[model samples]
Target: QIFRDVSKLLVERVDPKILNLFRLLGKFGDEVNMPVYVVGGFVRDLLLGIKNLDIDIVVEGNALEFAEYAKRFLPGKLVKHDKFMTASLFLKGGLRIDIATARLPDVEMSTIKKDLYRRDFTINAMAIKLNPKDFGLLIDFFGGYRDLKEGVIRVLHTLSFVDDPTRILRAIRFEQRFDFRIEETTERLLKQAVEEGYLERTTGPRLRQELEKILEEKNPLKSIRRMAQFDVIKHLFPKTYYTPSMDEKMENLFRNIPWVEENFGEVDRFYAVLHVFLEFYDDESWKEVRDRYSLRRNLINEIRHVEKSAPALLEMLSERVPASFVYPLVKGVSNETICHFLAYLSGEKEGLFKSYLLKIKNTKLEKINGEYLIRKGITSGKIIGEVLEKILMKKLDGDTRDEEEILEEVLASLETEGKLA
Candidate 1:
């Protein structure tokens, strides 16, 4: 047994809920006559003193059966991916525990060491036994602990990327996430894999899944910049290149995401981040990206509208147009586009756009609906809409403050035109 007892570390470092979970799993394993171990990222994170809620466990017996029995104790939803022989228990408070069946059978040679070998990276290829007596016994067949201490990302084998090219993106993500560097040999292998067109063999959905994970990071631009350094970006979008200005825009977007969410409620964050990456493309190039990624029609339209309107909006801001004038220009724009525009603008221009968003665009417009106009007997076919729009414009300009005052103004105008009796 190549194991060291780190049970004290487990008991001291882990959350009470997770600790209870480990104890329960150990008990269940004994009852079912199976060996269970907590594996992969959770162990790496625990060793690094990083608090992670995601847990992965491996069982020498059927994972499905273990999950079914485990669900009786856990107040979480059980979702099984039968094909992969894995199941996930989504507990309350955002804790997720992943259970997977060991690849080898329950023979004398079937140890957790064999399961650890099949993982993508050395840092992720370690496990801790969850047995009652051997709880928190660290198992390391690979030099994962040494790699983690040195702050390096190294794949288990040279064919790692060839076997699963998505690991290329995952490597960049982990390196950026941990502020670590790729090992020298692993870096060379990554470049070679890219040159050999391994990334090109990945399906669109698979590629998108990895891209989505990258975009979900706190500062995805860092990972994206690293990917570009490795020429991975060029492989994904051949005609695309990163510029300093684009980097600045993405940074601005990252800084503004929380602000946008706080004020605009919840915007489509992925669409907004993706927009920053593709915002500089021409119409044809943009359409190609949109079609390639299968983006939604509304997001496509939002991007197109922002692309077309941003310059004009900037010009208007430069001229110091009144909020009333700017209101009509951007009133029809979606919140997502507005947030993107805020990110794209600089200095006082950004402040002005934000004010327009919070003040004019989101203003409630005096509660005058079409039914209200029809009830007032100003019912011409399109004239009612025209009149209501005029009143709204006047209200936006601070020309009218009260509903009664606007109604009287409408009445007076109709009387002057002899359209009202």
Candidate 2:
């Protein structure tokens, strides 16, 4: 009853190509009297007024047969998976559509309804008829439309988490995304299910995969804070959430949205965010933390980088240092370190410390190198290395203007060190 007519929204907003594709399939489906609908997230997000280009089409007839028919007009490739009774296409324009038969042939119709029944939440269980005339007519078998309108996230069935506990995480993700609350009953089931040891049935790899998706979201910081608040992180990775420092670090992380988005690769970003949230404990505790979560090598390294960089950078910017001062400090560290350091500094000082950074940027290093040292008859490796350091330091300090002056200082240093012989 809560579902409104979204036909206008669909007509105005859906891509022309998508509507055409659906119309083709709908017409084809009518020829065989098969019922088809646009189901799942696509239907949910559409009614929510969120413009999502990814579409999921569910057919009541032969899924594979319907998919083959749907594939003819699509440019690029069609991929079929028999095990899951689904097919998908990655279109030329970079849009993706997932197709599935309304009922999986491998499972009984009753059981398939139960499968839909056992979905993580009601909002995801709603469907919209895809045929042109029936377009946007919603089919809510589980009160999903009510839940969606009430800003409530409720599991379709109680055993939802028991069947796949990853749904627990998914519930939290959907709730935070829409600013909705899990219905009180569903929330009770979530905490009780986690407490009753249902989570043990799930694997770290599966949970980690979901975590990666949640982490990559733009509002991932909020998602994580919610996880920590709901005791989800503690259930999944106990003792990992014990650090207050991690929370402080994560607060700084939210300020560096641009930097985190730019520098961290997909996998690296998740671990970096996790590390910033959970690296407050000692090394021994972290070992247990790493092993228990089954954290991967690359992710572990990213976490370590965040752990080291966040505090170290803050320590460096403790007082107002010159731009020339902070430049060498930043330049000497790894890119990861620079990112976290800059993120923290940006929050703590805002523009308070930027002047010195600009001052450092305005300064330049002379193009002096070891070869120049060698050309001056500095044969010993020690003398060449030592003189180069002194010359660069002097240049950085603005004591010398040209190479001739730099050479003079290097010669002077060599004489003072009794190495000019």
Candidate 3:
């Protein structure tokens, strides 16, 4: 049953330190005639009984000045924000707290409603009061309570993603954490926002922070899978790759590291998962690992694309099939391996299919080749070659000037003419 009094949650669900700190906040707010509330995830997790009681408070007055005296009562190292009227206090003990001004809200005082309205999710937008008079009062502007009860993650507005693309990952993080699903419209909007490739708007650090959190999540396998499922991974790291085989490997990898000093950066959980994630990277990737640690295996042999080479694909080719017609047959097979087998496995243009059979091939289209397609929006890799190959065929027969750049115009024109053929 949902508790009617938020104070009861404060007393029963939160830790002694949490209740004690909020009690002190109560007296301070009452005496100063300013109201304060424990907001965001502190209240959010408290309701779910996860008890993530990290102290985050909103004061109806100036927080930059409020924490000055708050440190006197709370006894912590106070850090002030220069522009935003907020401050943080990290206590001598492990406890930490944040004071955000409601001045009724930040910087030119808007209501709490205005503040929560700008947040990323319905579940996180709710707040609970900390002042004596209305302590534990819930301020839920977007029906976050219902969404939480229903195990749904919902965005407050359609533009939630338009403004902050990282919310796409946030939606999944909460879904995985609380065992929730994003709301119908929220899911639709999430997909639309991804198609728009809005993730490019986020700063490198902010976007990485979201990814780090998702990866650091207790078990991020599904979330990472969903990242590929929705093309979020490509949106985030356009150069990298994901496939069912790699998914299986990472499934074991996560289902399965660290050093210091000699390390160039402050590395942590992220690098461990990323290594496995990019284990068998494509043509132009992961030199950092081999170069950084020559100890790492080449793993090129472990890869299986050309060996056991499909005879059916050979048959499919004999039919003089569409370039894209051959795509599905070789889709999962890696390209370089295909080239390796095509060259060494037999021989190409220089040989033409062991004589009378007479087959031929040539040099690759660089600049805007498979790598470019992968970054541009081609999710699956091998199909990239065939699609590009067919166009290259067209380019050679009809040929000239536009060359690399013209590839773009032909692609759209052909893609429109025949979905992938």
Candidate 4:
């Protein structure tokens, strides 16, 4: 009866495509005679009345075989990992579903309850069985439903953090994401793990991956604060400490990302967020962090160049330079760097940055080209380039409002120089 109620709720709330996908999984489970359940964040989000398309299913049989069988109905590309007995189905419209065999193969534990024991957190350890008889049945072997309702983030075991310190970051992320508080014991265990230096055991790439997830959250400032409270940030950057200024900068970047996306189109929030901290470091320290984390060369170069240029940019802005002059200085810089600079600007300077971004930089210059210059009887290559540059600068400075105006001015200049017929 409860399953029926939840299923009705889910059908009403979820997208029709998702409903069809779940039904397909249920059909496959019945046909294969294997216990299959939608588990992890998908179930957690479902019970919370949230829409989440990322699905994780666990099969008490060969997950790869189950995924292959599922493909007959789902018609998506399958990627199998033999070592872990896991498979991923990538569907149309960027939807992804992961299928994994039940854990504890040595114990031969094929039951969903047994599988739930091996999970990291209470909220994520829940599942919904998909067999015909018990389709949509919510399974909570670890008090996941109860903790989720009470708004608490709890680890399944005391050693959960010790076993995987990345869970500490995950815990903070979930806590901030769902506006839940960490369970008392879970909080203590996280602190203990930090004191014991368990985070140091994690590879730099792994740590970077977790930090990226945190940075990707909607309001990562809260997660960053939580990480700082737990000394997790210090674990990542031993020489650095979180500050109010950094917090404000993060909040500004969070706001600026969507602004840039709306006006400039798809600026990389990750680099912009990371650049907040990188701004505090000198070139030597920045290079050290970059090398230690094996950050991408392009990102490293961007950070270096942006850092090198921001002071001059800020100084020029301070001097109240015309948008024409300022636009040329920053036209080649990345949107992420511009966002980083915008985050720290005063109210007037913020307005100045927006004006330059929205109006001056996007203003179309006069359409005269090198071919047009050649057609005008200006044969010297150097002079043609110089004249084009001069015309563009005039357009940028609002001196030449249209193509005709710039063309006439350029023609007159060429006539005086005896370059025009």
Give the per-residue lDDT digits (tens) of candidate 2, residues 215-253.
666577788787777678777765566346566666665
Candidate with better TM-score, 2 vs 3: 2
Winner by lDDT between candidate 4 and candidate 2? 4
- Candidate 3 per-residue lDDT, tens place, 1-421, comes to 2324677667888778768788788778777767677778977888788858478888877787667777777766888897879888898767778888773432322477677788899889888767776776887768888878899899998799999888999988987888898888988999999998788766667766887899767568888887888888776655456877557545643432111112122334454445444444664555543343232354434233332343544554464443433333333332222323232222232132222121113222333453465445645566565566655545433344434644565466455544543
Q: Relative to the unseen true structure, what is the C-alpha lDDT of residue 31 in candidate 2, on a scale of 0 to 100?
A: 69
User: What is the C-alpha local distance difference test score of each model?
Assistant: 0.78, 0.66, 0.63, 0.76
Highest lDDT: which candidate?
Answer: 1
TM-score of model number 1: 0.85
> Candidate 3: where is the Cα deviation over 4 Å?
1-4, 103-110, 257-269, 276-421
Candidate 2 collision pairs: 59-102, 323-356, 323-357
Ranking by lDDT: 1, 4, 2, 3
> Residue by residue across 1-421, what tens digits does model 4's lDDT show?
1222367766777798888788788779878867778889888888888888898988888899999999877766999899989999999858998999886422323366778877889989888877777775787767888888899999998889988898989889888788898999999999999988999887788888878888777578788778878888777776567788877777777767777778877777667867776665666776677787886556656665666776777777787887666665555667787777677675776777777766545664556453464456656777767666666666765654455655666666756654544
Which ranking of candidates, highest TM-score first? Answer: 1, 4, 2, 3
Write down the worst ten-residue block by lDDT for model 3.
256-265
Per-residue lDDT of 286 in model 3:
52
Query: Candidate 1: deviation at residue 218, Å?
Result: 2.4
- Compute the lDDT of residue 3 as modeled in candidate 1: 63
